[PDB]
Structure formats: structure tokens, C-alpha cells
């Protein structure tokens, strides 16, 4: 009876895989980036990457390889998920719409199977006869690639060697032949087998088994010209073949493990080698000509090329360009040069891609004082480590802001034909037109020539020929640049006036009620051309330079008044081409077609708040696609702006937005302002490159933020950040970090680079005297990061071998100071379990960190939370609750000790709490009167916990090492010794992400209950809320209906995706909504929407209300 809802806030940003090839077409070079459940398809260009296609999969991508079966024009995509969904995928373009089709699929998972060490390996043989799969120990699986087999049937072949490190198919081989390093007693080896598929046997390979290095771990199969196998291990690199053997051991590559390779030239002459330190190598195969024999291997060599971000994936592209897929840091695009620069670096960055990395911990703050949540993460590790400040929405920087009421429009206007800066932006008051004589400092109310202070401007653009145009209510007027005198004018033959403007820089292309003219202001006059009349009253107009026009404009957008329609004409012309009935009863308020970068659309804002958008085209003249999306509750007002190279649409309303686009699909992001009525781009004197903003009853000018839905800050650290707390009174963050140092010549330890803890402004060390009785070591610190500048104000170092595990910031009992507190442990590589450790009580009143209280403990203080003005804490399977004397010391209260490793704690504000490792979870209350711990209930499942959260009094949420979520509840029935003692897992759902931290808060605030944010190893941010039974059921319903509707890449079943899955068991998801799924209801076509409303009422327009309302939870 538990009802919950999970949505993604930020997609996974860590890169898990990346392959290069010819998937879009044969003339075409692609790069496929795998994230987790997402697949990214780019085309390699002279500049970098052409985004072409991003989809989602219903599983974690675990193998991703491209191949070419017999007689296929382009490559196919092989993919294998971690739940053992295999499919072959194809790229099909048909239309201007792209589709990723499943050639074949099936689940290749076996009942008999122990998931080996080093996980899943998916290889494909060079002739494309077969795909080799190593899922479990002692078995090799084989999916034959004959044009039948669309279901992907497989056989297994008992593998005598039950501990394989790595495997590849060998090039230049008569039968399919494997090559792999394995471990037994006696060390590590390489062996070869041929694979015969007629036989389903493993036949003797082409060459005798040799021994290789104890740490050999990578097998590269060299292409036909050389055709052997390189073997990468700590310290050693070696080529094997038939009876060839070659072996270099350059002492450079001993410092750090090689973890990833990539082939550079197709013949196998040069490779890339990714190191755990981020160093990039070139492995060079010295090739040597006989005349007749075959081209051979002379020698092996390594060049230290330089430094990338810590590479997990790596792929060479066109012409020196290499993509660097990182999991621990930002992914990048780098250049390889033949000549080094200063410091000997052949490598140069071109582009850097945000990875929110492993998010090891986080918290939510109100940084900018407003009730909007801001999220700050501990991200990355080692040299990639960092903080990331994450903000919802787009921001603007407020300068001088004149409290100027009732304003009605504005345009980019100057007072000269000179400086591209401007001094007066004549707008339009309530029925009126006014003047802002502004030196770019202070404003003035001296009114101007011909711009009568009792009429109104509709358009007012930079019209050449020495004039300051003023298409007014009455009818277009003229005030000269230099002369400033009233030049020429217009007036309606009857007694009538312009009602709707529309122009560029040489036109007056307006409307009088239903009439539509065109009056040219050449060298200071008026010059009419074409004329029609509308069946209805004209509401709005669009025309602007589109194609290769300057003066006279080509096409024509029209929003009419009684039939509620938007139509496509010409202008001149006005002829009918496409009438789109918008339906309902609110008239269009603004109309726009626009240059994105490459592709065109139509957008129309009704006066209710909604907006429609279509598939236009600035050259033919005909509409297509339909979509509806609501913004404001007031009539929305549109405008284009160019900020970088590209052009977006600012939408003005009570909920001001910006219209964007990914590939060329449409995105709608908030702007972080109160309300906005009118707006225009700028470039001024006292306020250069900018945006003018007419609001409720003020005005404003300032610059504008990035683009994305999310804003992301980034404070690099060059060491591993591990925990984080905000202290408001101190107005700073406490952050726990770790840095690596190696063995010194004098046995000491130093450091490979400047870290945040070494470069800290003030510093200090641990003067505790208790624990006193080629080599790597972790030095651990507590950093004091400033709140606004994010500089490292102070760095305290801990004892040698003291790891900092936990961190809190709080008041304790009657003392009115805020201490920060840290819980540590004495780690020696040898010792299996920490025997010692301490809780340390710091004070940062100002300037420095004072040690205020120190308390020895008997194990690793894995975590601690503030209680009720007490200190709750766990110590190596023990949960103590310390009190804080008026004499400044922590004295013990009670301790629970029935648990195996208590890793995680949270507190039901009051007196209840969770905690318990490997077991699963446990509920526990503090009995005030007794001064005691009472174990209330327990969940009895073998969940290896990673995170824990109290949703409420009777709901406990938990994340487990197998990418599952679940919810526990105490039973609501009699016999309070038994049933009230166990707690039922009332919710089950498979996330597909590893969760490190839950914490209550939200990014939205300027249908659902509660807000719990969560961060993941992959840099994915997620959100959990609660639901009523009816919502749950409405939503549950809509999910099955949708599954039927939505085509899935590869054709994997959504129910199978979201199922709970461990080694022990597999269950359908319960009590959980896949908000991502629910949300994707808005992307499907109008036909497909109706398909699932069928059957209080039941309507699609109605459903998109509910989903639009759900989307704004995050």
C-alpha cells in the first residue's frame, strides 16, 4: 500500500563506452557515446561533433560494438544490457525524422550462471560469423550471425578455464579463434581455442599456451598485417603470435595502471593507452619489410603523449582528434600534435564536457537568498575531483532598474547612426509614448519631437536613410535622424487607424482591423505596394528577412480573430496557402517563424498562456507537425534574440521562458524572474551587450545566463572530495577531502600535484597525541570553502593514516555555538577492520579551526547525524548517542549493537532512526524517559545498502548495491511482538543507477507530497515524491497503456526494465511510478495520445494537463 514516483532531473553524464564507425551512412564517420541508459550519436566534423541522435534504452548499456555483416551498406549496432537484453540496431533516416530500428533481439541470460569477475565481455569475430559473450565463469556463449536468427538464439560452450581476465577474437585466422589471459594457481597465461559452430566444441587453437605477467589484463588483437595479440599488464607490454614473442618494459608505465586502449591506424601500427593517472601514451609497432615473406614486427615502443582527464573510454577520430570518455571526470575532445609545446605536451584540449562524475555526497542550500534550492555536489575523484553548484533555470544580472510603471513595448533604439550603443529606448506607456534621455547612468523626462507623448508606437526598428521610425496608433509617423522634424505621415482615408504593426528595417507592413496594406518609408516618405482584406479581424502579424532578403520581406504569418486561426501567406501577397484552425475560443496574441540554426517552425501564443508550434519552412509555405505547450496564465508575448552564435525565442508572460532546441527538437526552460511583459535584445552605452526587460511596474537591463534547463558552476579541487556540509552562521561549506602522496626517497610522503588542501589560504595540522605507539598513501583533510567565492579559506590535516568518513555541522545541547564535527578512522592497508578512530569537534568562529573536543573510539565512525541536540553516531557496528556536557565533552549515552556494520543513519526529526549494513535496514526509537534505544522493527532481506532515507513516519526508502530502490513500512496489524516487529517491503523498483546520497529538498520552488533528491555514481540526479492512491492508479493505468503505444529501441519490455533484480530474486515493480515514462507521454503523436485515454471523464488534452503539472516537480 505504498505509492511513490521517481523522475530524472539530470541525465547520467558519466561516459561508460564509446565506439567509432559508419552507422549513419558509409560516407560518414560517427561517434557513439554510451552513457548508461542513453545512447549518443554524433557525426565527426572538421570542427568537432555533429549531434545527430540521442535515444534512451530500457537497461544499462554493457557492451556496445559496431559491425558489418555480409553485404550491408552501413554498420550495424550491437548492444547488450546488464540484464542480458541483446539486440542488433540500425540507423534509418527516411524523411527528415530519424529512427533507430531493431533488426534483432532476445534475452541471453542463463539460469545456470555465476556472473564472473571483470563482468560482461562482448566480442565480435573479424568475419562476422559470430558474437562471443563471456557472461559467467566456465561458460562461453555464442550468438551466430546468420541472416536468420532474428530472435538471436545462442549456444554455450563449457570453458575449461573458470577465471578469465580478458578475451578477444584474433585477426588473420582461418577459423574463428579466441585469445584470452586467465588466472589459476601457477600465475597467469594466454591460451587459444578455435570456435567451431557446426560442432559447438572448442578445438585446439593455433598456438601453444605461454605464461604472461601476474598483472596482465588487456588483450588487443592486432589486424591482419601483423595479426597477433598484445598483452598489457603492470610493468610489462608484450606481443605474441604463433612462435613470435616481443617484450618491452619501459619504466615509465609502471607508475600507474594502463586501463584503456584504442587503435589509431587500421593496420595496427599505432595505439592509444589510457593510464589511471590520466597520462596518454602512444604504443608504436615498429613494422619491418622483407621483400617476400609477410610484413613483420621489429620492435615495440611507447611515447608519453601528455595528460587527459582520467579515461575510461577512448577513441581516435579524424586527423589528430581524440575523444576522451571519462567516468571520474569531465569528458573531452583533445588534439594530438606532432611537436610538443612547453612541458613536452603533445595533447591540447579543444572541448570539455560536464560530468557530474561520481557524486559521492551532496546538500541543498539557498545560496542566492531566494526560496530556490541550490544543489552542491562532491564530484569526481583524484585530480578530477570538484564541487558542482547546480541551479534550476536561466538567470539575469540586474543593474539600474527604473521604477517605471505601465509600459507597453520596446525595441532596440539609439539616438545616432554612430556608436552601435544606444542612449534612449523609447517604449510605450498606457496608451502613450514616452522618452528616456539616458546617458547610460540616469534617466530623464524630456519628451521628443513627433513622438507625441499622447500616442503609441507598435514597431520601431533601425531603419536606414537617416530616420527614427515610429509606426503609431494613429498611423506611421516620421521623425528624421539629423533634422528631427516631422518628415512625412500617414492617415486612414476614413477616420481609421493601424491596429497591428509588423516590420524589419525598411517596411510598414500593417493591418487596419481586417485590412492589410504595406507603406514604404524610403528616403523620408511613404510608398505603398499590395493590398487585401481578411474574412476576420486581424490579431497579430509576422514578417522578417528570411532567405536572402533585406528590405522587402518574403512570407507572411497571420493570427485572426473569430475563427481563431493562424495562416501562411505572402507579403507583398496575402494569398491563402494553409489555414490552421487553432480551435477553442481565445484569440492568438503573437505569431513567429524563426531561424534556429538550420530548420524552420511556426509558433503561436494564445492569450490563455498556451502556445502551439508547427513544421514550417521559410521558402515554400506550408505547415506540418502539431504540438501544444502552456507557459503563462496570461497572454504570452514573443521575441527573438541572439546571445552566442545562435538564435532563440524569449517568451514574455507570468512565468517567463526561453524557447530552445537540442538537436532540433524543442526545449522550454524557465527564466528566474518574477514577471516579464515586454523584452528586447540590446548592446548599449551604460549597459552593453544585454536584454531590456519591461516588467509588471518596473524596468530592467542586464545580461543572460547559459542556456540549459540546469545551470552548473564547477569548483575544481585536484583531489577527492568525500563529504559536504553547509554552515550558514559561518557562511561557508565544510568539505572532507583526500589527496594521494607517494613514497619519498627518504621514506616520507610528498604529493604529485598542488591540491586544494595544499593551496589553501590558511592551514593547520592535528596536534592530537593519542594513537602513538613506490608506495601510495591517502592524506585526509577538512576544507573550509567560502560560500560566495568558493575559495579554500582553511585546510586542516588529519593524523597520518586517519581517514575522515563522516561530517556534521550543528549546535549541541545548551551551547549556542556551531561546531563542525568529523568522524574518522585508523586505516592500515594490512588491517581488515579499523580498530581505532575518533570523533573530533571543531570550531570555526572565524579565521581558523580550533579543536574543541576530541574523543577516542574503538572503530570506524562510518556516519553521524545530529539528533535532539545530542550526537547520534555509528562506530563499526554500534550505534551510540553522545551527550554534550556543559564542560565541553562527549559522554556516552546508550548504544544499540545488534547489526553488522552500521553504515547509514537518518532521523525522524523526533526520536526514530534507520541504520544497518549487509543486513538491510532497521528501525529504532529513542525512549526519552528510559534514556534508551529500543529496537522497533527490522527488514529481513539481504540488501547490501548504499543509501537510506526517511520519507515519513511509516515510510523508509533505501538504495542497494544492485541498482534497486525499495520502501519499507511497519505492519498495521495485531500481535505487536511479531508482525509489528517485521517491516514489509511495500515498494520495489529497479533504478539502474547506484545511489550515494539521498537528501530532502527541491530545486524548483520559486498533486505530489515531499521532495527527496538523490545523486548517483553516474552523475545522475533523481527525485522521489509521494502520491495518493488515485494518482498512483491513474498513473499506473496510464503506464501500461503507454507501454503498448511507445516503440522501444531493441524492443525491450518496460516491465522487464523496471523489475526488482538481485542474484536471489526477480519481481515486478510495486508502489512505484517511472516518472520519466509518464513524462514521455508529451512526445508522442496526437493519434497515439488518443489511443490511450479511451476510458470522471477521459481526454488527452486533459492528460497533458496532468503531465505538464507533473513536469514542474523538478
Amino acid at each position: 500500500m505504498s505509492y511513490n514516483y521517481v523522475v530524472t532531473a539530470q541525465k547520467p553524464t558519466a561516459v561508460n563506452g564509446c565506439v567509432t564507425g559508419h552507422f549513419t551512412s558509409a560516407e560518414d564517420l560517427n561517434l557513439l557515446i554510451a552513457k548508461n541508459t542513453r545512447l549518443e550519436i554524433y557525426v565527426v566534423t572538421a570542427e568537432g561533433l555533429r549531434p545527430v541522435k540521442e535515444v534512451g534504452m530500457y537497461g544499462k548499456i554493457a557492451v556496445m560494438e559496431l559491425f558489418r555483416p555480409k553485404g550491408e551498406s552501413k554498420d550495424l549496432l550491437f548492444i547488450l544490457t546488464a540484464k542480458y537484453n541483446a539486440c542488433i540496431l540500425e540507423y534509418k533516416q527516411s524523411g527528415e525524422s530519424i529512427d533507430i530500428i531493431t533488426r534483432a533481439h532476445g534475452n541471453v541470460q542463463d539460469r545456470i550462471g555465476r556472473p564472473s569477475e571483470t563482468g560482461i565481455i562482448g566480442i565480435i569475430d573479424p568475419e562476422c560469423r559470430m558474437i562471443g559473450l563471456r557472461l559467467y565463469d566456465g561458460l562461453f556463449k555464442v550468438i551466430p550471425l546468420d541472416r536468420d536468427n532474428k530472435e538471436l538464439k545462442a549456444f554455450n560452450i563449457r570453458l575449461e578455464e573458470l577465471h578469465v581476465i580478458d578475451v578477444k577474437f584474433l585477426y588473420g585466422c582461418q577459423a574463428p579463434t579466441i585469445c584470452f589471459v586467465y588466472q589459476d594457481p601457477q600465475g597467469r597465461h594466454v591460451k587459444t581455442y578455435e570456435v567451431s559452430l557446426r560442432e559447438k566444441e572448442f578445438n585446439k587453437g593455433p598456438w601453444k599456451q605461454e605464461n604472461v605477467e601476474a598483472e596482465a589484463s588487456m588483450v588487443i588483437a592486432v589486424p591482419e598485417p601483423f595479426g597477433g595479440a598484445i598483452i598489457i599488464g603492470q610493468e610489462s607490454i608484450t606481443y605474441h603470435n604463433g612462435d613470435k614473442y616481443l617484450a618491452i618494459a619501459p619504466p615509465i608505465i609502471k607508475q600507474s595502471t594502463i586501463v584503456c586502449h584504442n587503435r589509431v591506424d587500421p593496420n595496427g601500427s599505432r595505439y592509444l593507452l589510457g593510464d589511471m593517472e590520466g597520462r596518454l601514451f602512444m604504443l608504436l609497432l615498429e613494422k619491418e619489410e622483407q621483400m617476400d615473406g609477410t610484413v613483420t614486427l621489429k620492435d615495440l615502443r611507447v611515447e608519453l603523449l601528455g595528460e587527459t582527464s582520467i579515461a575510461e573510454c577512448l577513441t581516435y577520430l579524424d586527423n589528430g582528434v581524440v575523444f576522451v570518455g571519462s567516468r571520474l571526470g569531465d569528458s573531452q575532445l583533445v588534439k594530438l600534435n606532432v611537436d610538443s609545446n612547453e612541458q613536452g605536451s603533445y595533447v591540447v584540449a579543444m572541448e570539455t564536457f560536464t560530468n557530474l562524475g561520481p557524486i559521492v555526497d551532496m546538500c541543498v542550500v539557498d545560496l542566492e537568498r531566494q526560496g530556490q534550492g541550490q544543489l552542491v555536489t562532491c564530484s569526481g575523484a583524484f585530480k578530477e575531483g570538484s564541487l558542482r553548484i547546480i541551479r534550476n533555470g536561466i538567470g539575469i544580472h540586474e543593474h539600474a532598474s527604473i521604477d517605471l510603471p505601465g509600459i507597453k513595448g520596446l525595441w532596440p533604439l539609439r539616438s545616432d547612426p554612430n556608436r552601435e550603443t544606444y542612449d534612449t529606448l523609447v517604449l510605450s506607456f498606457v496608451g502613450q509614448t514616452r522618452v528616456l534621455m539616458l546617458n547610460g547612468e540616469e534617466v530623464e523626462e524630456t519628451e521628443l519631437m513627433g513622438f507625441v507623448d499622447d500616442q503609441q508606437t507598435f514597431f520601431c526598428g533601425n531603419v536606414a536613410h537617416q530616420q527614427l521610425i515610429q509606426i503609431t496608433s494613429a498611423s506611421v509617423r516620421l521623425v528624421s535622424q539629423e533634422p528631427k522634424a516631422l518628415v512625412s505621415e500617414w492617415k486612414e482615408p476614413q477616420a481609421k487607424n493601424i491596429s497591428v504593426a509588423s516590420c524589419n528595417s525598411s517596411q510598414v507592413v500593417v493591418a487596419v482591423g481586417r485590412a492589410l496594406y504595406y507603406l514604404q518609408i524610403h528616403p523620408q516618405e511613404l510608398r505603398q505596394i499590395s493590398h487585401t482584406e481578411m474574412e476576420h479581424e486581424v490579431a497579430c502579424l509576422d514578417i522578417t528577412p528570411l532567405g536572402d532578403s533585406n528590405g522587402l520581406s518574403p512570407l507572411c504569418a497571420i493570427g485572426l480573430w473569430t475563427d481563431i486561426s493562424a495562416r501562411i501567406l505572402k507579403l507583398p501577397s496575402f494569398e491563402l496557402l494553409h489555414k490552421e484552425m487553432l480551435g477553442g475560443e481565445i484569440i492568438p496574441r503573437s505569431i513567429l517563424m524563426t531561424t534556429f540554426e538550420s530548420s524552420h517552425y511556426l509558433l503561436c501564443a494564445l492569450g490563455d498562456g498556451a502556445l502551439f508550434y508547427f513544421g514550417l519552412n521559410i521558402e515554400t509555405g506550408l505547415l506540418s507537425d502539431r504540438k501544444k505547450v502552456t507557459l503563462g496564465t496570461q497572454p504570452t508575448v514573443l521575441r527573438t534574440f541572439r546571445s552566442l552564435s545562435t538564435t532563440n525565442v524569449f517568451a514574455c508572460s507570468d512565468r517567463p521562458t526561453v524557447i530552445y532546441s537540442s538537436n532540433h527538437k524543442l526545449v522550454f526552460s524557465n527564466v528566474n524572474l518574477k514577471e516579464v511583459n515586454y523584452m528586447c535584445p540590446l548592446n548599449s552605452d551604460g549597459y552593453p551587450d544585454s536584454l531590456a526587460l519591461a516588467n509588471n511596474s518596473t524596468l530592467t537591463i542586464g545580461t543572460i545566463d547559459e542556456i540549459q534547463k540546469l545551470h552548473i558552476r564547477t569548483v575544481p579541487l585536484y583531489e577527492s572530495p568525500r563529504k559536504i556540509c553547509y554552515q550558514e552562521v559561518s557562511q561557508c561549506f565544510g568539505v572532507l577531502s583526500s589527496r594521494i602522496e607517494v613514497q619519498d626517497t627518504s621514506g616520507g610522503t610528498t604529493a604529485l600535484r598542488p591540491s586544494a588542501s595544499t593551496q589553501a589560504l590558511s592551514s593547520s595540522v592535528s596536534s592530537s597525541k593519542l594513537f602513538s605507539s613506490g608506495e601510495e598513501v591517502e592524506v585526509h583533510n577538512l576544507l573550509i570553502i567560502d560560500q560566495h567565492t568558493f575559495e579554500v579559506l582553511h585546510a586542516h590535516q588529519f593524523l597520518q593514516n586517519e581517514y575522515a568518513l563522516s561530517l556534521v555541522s550543528c549546535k549541541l545541547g545548551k551551547d549556542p555555538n556551531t561546531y563542525f564535527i568529523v568522524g574518522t578512522a585508523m586505516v592500515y592497508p594490512e588491517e581488515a577492520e579499523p580498530k581505532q578512530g575518533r570523533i573530533v569537534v571543531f570550531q570555526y568562529s572565524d579565521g581558523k579551526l580550533q579543536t574543541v573536543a576530541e574523543k577516542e573510539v574503538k572503530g570506524a565512525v562510518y556516519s553521524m547525524v545530529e539528533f535532539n541536540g545530542k550526537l547520534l553516531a555509528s562506530i563499526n557496528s554500534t550505534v551510540r548517542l553522545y551527550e554534550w556536557t556543559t564542560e565541553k565533552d562527549v559522554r556516552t549515552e546508550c548504544n544499540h549493537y545488534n547489526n553488522i556494520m552500521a553504515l547509514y543513519l537518518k532521523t525522524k526529526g523526533d526520536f526514530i532512526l534507520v541504520g544497518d549494513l549487509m543486513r538491510s535496514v532497521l528501525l529504532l526509537a529513542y525512549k526519552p524517559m528510559e534514556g534508551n534505544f529500543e529496537e522497533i522493527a527490522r527488514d529481513f532481506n539481504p540488501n547490501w545498502m548504499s543509501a537510506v532515507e526517511i520519507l515519513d513516519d511509516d515510510n523508509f526508502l533505501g538504495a542497494e548495491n544492485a541498482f534497486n530502490l525499495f520502501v519499507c513500512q511497519k505492519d498495521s496489524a495485531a500481535t505487536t511482538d511479531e508482525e509489528r516487529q517485521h517491516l514489509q517491503e511495500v515498494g520495489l523498483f529497479h533504478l539502474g543507477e547506484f545511489v550515494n546520497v539521498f537528501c530532502h529538498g527541491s530545486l524548483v520552488m520559486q498533486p505530489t507530497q515531499g521532495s527527496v533528491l538523490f545523486g548517483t555514481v553516474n552523475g545522475m540526479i533523481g527525485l522521489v515524491t509521494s502520491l495518493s492512491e488515485s494518482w498512483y492508479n491513474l498513473l499506473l493505468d496510464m503506464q501500461n497503456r503507454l507501454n503498448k503505444v511507445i516503440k522501444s529501441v531493441g524492443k525491450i519490455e518496460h516491465s522487464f526494465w523496471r523489475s526488482f533484480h538481485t542474484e536471489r530474486k526477480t519481481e515486478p515493480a510495486t508502489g512505484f511510478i517511472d516518472g520519466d515514462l509518464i513524462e514521455s507521454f508529451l512526445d508522442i503523436s496526437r493519434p497515439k495520445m488518443q489511443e490511450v485515454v479511451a476510458n470522471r471523464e477521459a481526454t488527452a488534452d486533459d492528460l497533458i494537463k496532468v503531465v505538464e503539472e507533473l513536469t514542474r516537480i523538478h
Binding site: 561520481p358 581517514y803 586505516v827 588491517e831 570506524a860 548504499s946 547506484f994 555514481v1017 553516474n1018
Partner: peptide, 14 residues
């Protein structure tokens, strides 16, 4: 050192 092995998981490792 379980502490180590432990933290490694947080970084998504063996």
C-alpha cells in the same frame, strides 16, 4: 581495510 573496498563502491569500483 574494508573502509577502502567500501569507499571504492561509492566511486563505482570492485
Amino acid at each position: 581495510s574494508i573502509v577502502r573496498t567500501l569507499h571504492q563502491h561509492k566511486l563505482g569500483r570492485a
